[PDB]
Amino acid sequence: ECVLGQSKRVDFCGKGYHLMSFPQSAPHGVVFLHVTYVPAQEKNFTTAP
Amino acid sequence: SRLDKVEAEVQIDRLITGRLQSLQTYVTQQLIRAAEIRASANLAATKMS
Ligand SMILES: *[C@@H]1O[C@H](CO)[C@@H](O[C@@H]2O[C@H](CO)[C@@H](O)[C@H](O)[C@H]2NC(C)=O)[C@H](O)[C@H]1NC(C)=O
Known part of the structure; x- marks a missing residue:
């Protein structure tokens, strides 16, 4: 599920959004060696539904 | 109280063997139960994530 694919299970393969x-x-x-995408440098915005 | 130190060892070794086997049974069953508790804890750690 992590070398032969990309897993959507949270924290199954590394902390972050699993890439490979x-x-x-x-x-x-x-x-x-879990390669993940970790978001960085957030910024506040005003939002609306 | 009843037997001298040479006739007492014949009985005390029986008691020691039996009680050591009791402890061994307890520890073996604790290991078998800890394996199942650890499976349950791994499932709970997967459900958390
Ligand atoms: C998004 O907005 C919040 C609210 O202003 C920011 O959090 C505050 O940051 C200041 C420091 O500048 C602290 O003194 C406050 O205690 C924080 N919280 C609150 C409830 O006011 C936060 O830093 C902003 N995030 C970004 C990425 O800009």
Whole structure:
């Protein structure tokens, strides 16, 4: 769900909006490099429905 | 109170073996219950996110 696709599940693959992941092999395990999109530099606006 | 230190060991070793087995049974069942509690806690951490 994260190397073979893009997941919409929140915090399943990294903190942020998941873009993609890269698997790396570790001894007796696996390491995922989760690439996410994190919004930055917010600014206040007035809004309306 | 009834037996001397050589006849008492025959009985005390029986008691020790039995009580150690009681503790072992308790700990084994606590591990098996902790696995299920951890599955439930992982599900709750997934539902939170
Ligand atoms: C969006 O507006 C709020 C409200 O003005 C800003 O929050 C205040 O920031 C000031 C510092 O400049 C604090 O002293 C206040 O306590 C904050 N809150 C409130 C309730 O007034 C907030 O900084 C603005 N956000 C952006 C990104 O501009």
